[PDB]
């Protein structure tokens, strides 16, 4: 990635070289390797234009394995450009650009031709929401009039997701697929500033509510596979739910909740952990504006210690209190004065909550059970003894 930044073209003309060599050949090969290396190669917005239009005019002649491949390939690229060049994405909003609109157009047609089956529409979908999204107006269109075949085929896609999305469809696998095509569509809807407010955020809208019943619905638990659940998908929703609505979040009590099932909790630890330490973008929310919690994350440790204690002296019920209380240390680590806010202070005849934190601490890292968590616990308990951190245990008389 670092190499790609400078010799670009050297890496580029290797892989354009492959893709030659696939289109004029009819014999399918599966060393697709030399595709691949796009997932990783550092790549611009004036790099991509090269990407899409070069791949546009071989995307038909290439093998099934082969389109695949780039599709995988491409799409990850696309995150790369927006992570790596966040401002470059807001400006495509910000000012129309015919040129990105035209190429993502093109081979949204020839993408959309190659795909017929159900199974074949699932892998590509999400790739077409992408670029759906580089082209905005399209987007307004599709809400609008509809043109006969100019916008008829990407106004089809759009409702197809809805239905999938919904439920109607009497398909597991569209259903699957439009979570995650959706969920990348709020993930991008995130980045916008929100001053424009463009057709993304009310078409997010439309869709955000559908999505949460789906994937935080407690009394059914969301099954993508073997998982009992995809815990990164439910992760990365949150997160964008939360910037899209931090100030009073509706779920974040029904994961809080303790009658809530253990993954909601560690889906919701996670997703905090991430908050924390992956704030690119200032005019995001922040950590400060969840202190509210913290009387109630502090209820949520203390029963876990004493499972997690008791447990190891089910076997699955056991060791997922282990990840989910690996999980709080290192956020406690992260942050001390997460879980330090409104302190409880020490009762008359009962200990306050500063204490009853550390002493949990303290009894588990002589254990030798968990030698990862002991090992962190000491990290952990060293840093709630900062000069800074001394003050947070107690307020009132902290030398005392």
């Given at each position: ?8 073209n050297a890496?580029?003309?290797?892989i354009?070289?492959?893709l030659?060599?696939?289109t ?7 060393d697709?390797?030399d595709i691949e290396?796009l997932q990783?190669?550092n790549v611009?917005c004036?790099?991509?234009k090269?990407?899409?239009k ?5 995307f ?5 394995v082969?389109?695949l491949?780039?599709?995988?390939s491409?799409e ?8 790596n060049?966040?401002?470059?994405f807001?400006?495509?909003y910000?000012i129309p650009?015919?040129?990105m609109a035209?190429?993502?157009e093109?081979?949204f047609?020839?993408?959309d031709?190659?795909?017929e089956?159900t199974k074949?529409?699932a892998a590509v ?6 670029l759906?999204?580089?082209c905005p107006?399209?987007?307004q269109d ?7 075949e100019?916008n008829?085929?990407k ?9 999938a999305?919904a ?7 569209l259903?699957?697929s439009?979570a ?20 993304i955020?009310l078409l997010?809208?439309?869709?955000v509510?559908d999505?949460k019943?789906?994937?935080?619905n ?15 998908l439910?992760?990365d929703?949150?997160?964008?739910c939360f ?14 909740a ?12 996670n997703s905090?952990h991430?908050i924390?330490t ?5 005019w ?11 009387v ?15 447990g190891?002296?089910?076997?699955l019920?056991?060791?997922?209190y282990k990840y989910?209380l ?5 956020l406690?680590?992260?942050?001390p004065?997460?879980?330090?806010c409104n302190?409880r202070?020490?009762?008359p005849?009962?200990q306050?909550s500063?204490?009853?934190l ?7 890292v002589?254990?030798?059970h968990?030698?990862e968590?002991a090992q962190e616990?000491?990290e ?7 000069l800074?951190?001394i003050?947070?245990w107690?307020?009132?008389a902290?030398?005392?």
């Open positions: 990635f670092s190499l790609s930044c400078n010799n670009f890496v580029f003309s290797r354009s070289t492959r030659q060599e696939l004029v050949c009819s014999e399918d090969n599966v697709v390797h290396l990783y190669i611009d004036a790099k991509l090269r990407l899409l070069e791949t546009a005019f071989k038909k002649a290439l093998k099934k082969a389109q491949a780039v599709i995988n491409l990850k690229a696309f995150w790369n450009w927006v992570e060049y966040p401002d470059e807001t400006k495509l910000q650009q015919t040129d035209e190429c993502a093109k081979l047609d020839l993408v031709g190659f795909a089956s074949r529409k979908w999400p790739l077409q929401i992408i759906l999204i580089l107006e399209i987007i599709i809400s609008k009039d509809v043109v006969d100019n008829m085929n106004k089809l896609f759009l409702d197809s997701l809805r239905k999305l439920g109607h469809g009497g398909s597991r696998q259903t699957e439009a995650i095509a959706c969920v990348k569509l709020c993930k991008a809807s995130t980045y916008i500033n929100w001053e424009d407010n463009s057709v955020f997010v809208q439309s869709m509510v999505l019943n789906l994937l935080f407690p009394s059914k638990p969301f099954s993508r596979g073997s998982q009992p659940a995809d815990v990164d439910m992760i929703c949150l997160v964008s910037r899209i609505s931090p100030h009073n979040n509706q779920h974040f009590k029904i994961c809080l303790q009658n809530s099932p253990s993954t909601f909790h560690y889906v919701l630890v905090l991430r924390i992956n704030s690119a973008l200032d995001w929310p922040k950590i400060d504006a969840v202190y509210c919690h913290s109630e994350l502090r209820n949520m440790f203390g029963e876990t210690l004493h499972k997690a204690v008791q190891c002296g089910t076997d019920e056991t060791r997922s989910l690996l999980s709080m240390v290192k406690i680590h992260a942050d004065k997460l879980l330090l302190p202070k020490q009762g005849e009962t306050g500063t204490a009853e550390i002493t949990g601490l303290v009894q588990l002589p254990q030798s968990m030698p968590i616990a000491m952990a308990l060293l840093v709630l003894h900062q800074d951190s003050d947070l107690n307020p009132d902290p030398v005392e």
